[PDB]
Structure formats: structure tokens, C-alpha cells
Amino acid sequence: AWKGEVLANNEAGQVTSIIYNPGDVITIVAAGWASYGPTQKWGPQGDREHPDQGLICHDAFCGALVMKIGNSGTIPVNTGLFRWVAPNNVQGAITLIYNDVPGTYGNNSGSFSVNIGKDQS
Amino acid sequence: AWKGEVLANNEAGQVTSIIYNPGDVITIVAAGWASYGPTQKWGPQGDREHPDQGLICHDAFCGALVMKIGNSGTIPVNTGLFRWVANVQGAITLIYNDVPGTYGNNSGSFSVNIGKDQS
Ligand SMILES: CO[C@@H]1O[C@H](CO)[C@H](O)[C@H](O)[C@H]1O[C@H]1O[C@H](CO)[C@H](O)[C@H](O)[C@H]1O
Ligand SMILES: OC[C@H]1O[C@H](O)[C@H](O)[C@@H](O)[C@H]1O
Ligand SMILES: [Ca+2]
Ligand SMILES: [Ca+2]
């Protein structure tokens, strides 16, 4: 049961209190409005119209919510995950990150409100 | 225990297998790209720039996911609901947030998962 925020302009991400363990089943709901530069704002799925220019997650759009579990590569979160189990050999603290190009977070604004819970297993 | 899709052009909503009962704790997660007219698509939170011209849900943007429970007013769903508790009682119908009579030109759909949680 973690609840908190993820700033668009935070390159390092938001480390949550959720340690993902082998067999854990998780739910995530992400909401909100944030920008990677422009005056317009996008939701947790990001901007489907914008080209990939070196995103930390190539499998999500610019401005999408992504995560790392432990020492994993980025995993798309987008609007959330429903009763979700990680690939085998993936474990450790969940960090939530705004999908942008490394070095380009200065002009980002807004944030995502995210809830994460462990489910019956 | 319910998984499927909600079409933008379905005025009448998607009637799900979830009957909401007093005290029930539920989770919805909605995903995908849909439209209420334009060639451009929006997500489950809808179009934050477009004004309200008599949307079925005044509490959400045009093109947002909403729902009804039984005979109730529209309730915002947006990207989903996390361990949400609702006198609201009955079958959960999911609906695209648009204006009555004008669904004909909508396109796309949202993916939606609903479950009941521990309580
Ligand atoms: C659409 O924003 C900017 O477009 C120009 C073209 O005129 C360039 O392609 C820039 O790279 C774009 O900058 C924005 O996007 C990148 C991510 O791709 C980054 O977030 C930057 O901070 C933004 O301004
Ligand atoms: O505001 C709602 C309204 O917006 C646009 O004009 C659409 O083309 C219409 O079909 C209707 O959905
Ligand atoms: Ca940026
Ligand atoms: Ca329409």
C-alpha cells in the first residue's frame, strides 16, 4: 500500500516503498497531467504523436509513466497494471519514472498521482 | 472478474458482469486511445481542452471513461479506480463520456479490467 506522486521534471524518479518479491501480484493506478516541455499536457500514456528521441523507455511514448523494479530495465506502467506479475528474475524496490530523454527533464512540469498495492496471491 | 473493451461510439454503455454490492471494494484499470469525433485520439482521462456541451458526466472531460452503478448518475472513472468503495448499488455499466445523440462519429475504445478486492 504505497500512494504518492511522481514529478515530470525528476530524472531519477520516485523511489516507492514497494519491494517487489518473487510471486508478488501488484496493481497500479496512475492518474494526472504532465508535460515534457510544451504548454499542452498529457496523461499517464504520454504523447502518442511525439517521436522517440532517446527515451529511457523505448516501449512507451514520451511523457508516459514507466518503472524499474530493482536493477531491471524500464517497464511501461502507462495508466496502470491490473493484478500483474513481473517477469521471472525481476525483483527489488519499484521506482516510478517519467518517460523523457536523458538530460531534457528541466522543462517538464506537472506530475502523476500513483497508487501501488500487493494483491491476493 | 470482468475484462473487455468499451467502444467510444456505444451510447448505451458496456454492461459488465460486476454487480456492485454495499461495502464492495473494487479496482478498475482503463487503457487505450479513443475519440469523440476528431482524427486525434485521447486516453481514459479524455480531452482536457474541450468544453462541456452537455456531457453525460459533468465531473469528467469529454472522452473520459465514466460508469454508472445500477440506477445511479455517472461517476468518473478516468484511468481507473484503486480500491474504491462507492446508497449506490447494482450492475456496473462503463460508458464513454460524450453528449447524447452525438456518439455516431466516435471511434476507438478503452481496455478495461474490473475486480473485487479484499474487504
Ligand atoms: C516537440 O518538442 C520539441 O520539438 C523540437 C522540434 O522543433 C525538437 O524535436 C525537440 O527535441 C523537442 O523537445 C521536446 O521533446 C524532447 C523529448 O523528445 C525533450 O523532452 C525536450 O525537453 C522537449 O522540449
Ligand atoms: O462536445 C462534444 C461534441 O464535440 C465535437 O464537436 C464532436 O464532433 C461531437 O460529436 C460531440 O461529441
Ligand atoms: Ca523535457
Ligand atoms: Ca461524438
From Swiss-Prot, chain B:
Compartments reported by the entry: Cytoplasm; Periplasm; Cell surface
GO molecular function: carbohydrate binding
InterPro entries for this protein: Galactose-bd-like_sf (IPR008979), PA-IL (IPR012905)
Function text: D-galactose specific lectin. Binds in decreasing order of affinity: melibiose, methyl-alpha-D-galactoside, D-galactose, methyl-beta-D-galactoside, N-acetyl-D-galactosamine. Similar to plant lectins in its selective (carbohydrate-specific) hemagglutinating activity.
Keyword hit for Cytoplasm: yes
Matches recorded under Pfam families: PA-IL
Keywords: Cytoplasm, Lectin, Periplasm
Species of the source: Pseudomonas aeruginosa (strain ATCC 15692 / DSM 22644 / CIP 104116 / JCM 14847 / LMG 12228 / 1C / PRS 101 / PAO1)
Source taxonomy: Bacteria, Pseudomonadati, Pseudomonadota, Gammaproteobacteria, Pseudomonadales
Annotated GO biological process: heterophilic cell-cell adhesion via plasma membrane cell adhesion molecules
Name of the protein in its database record: PA-I galactophilic lectin
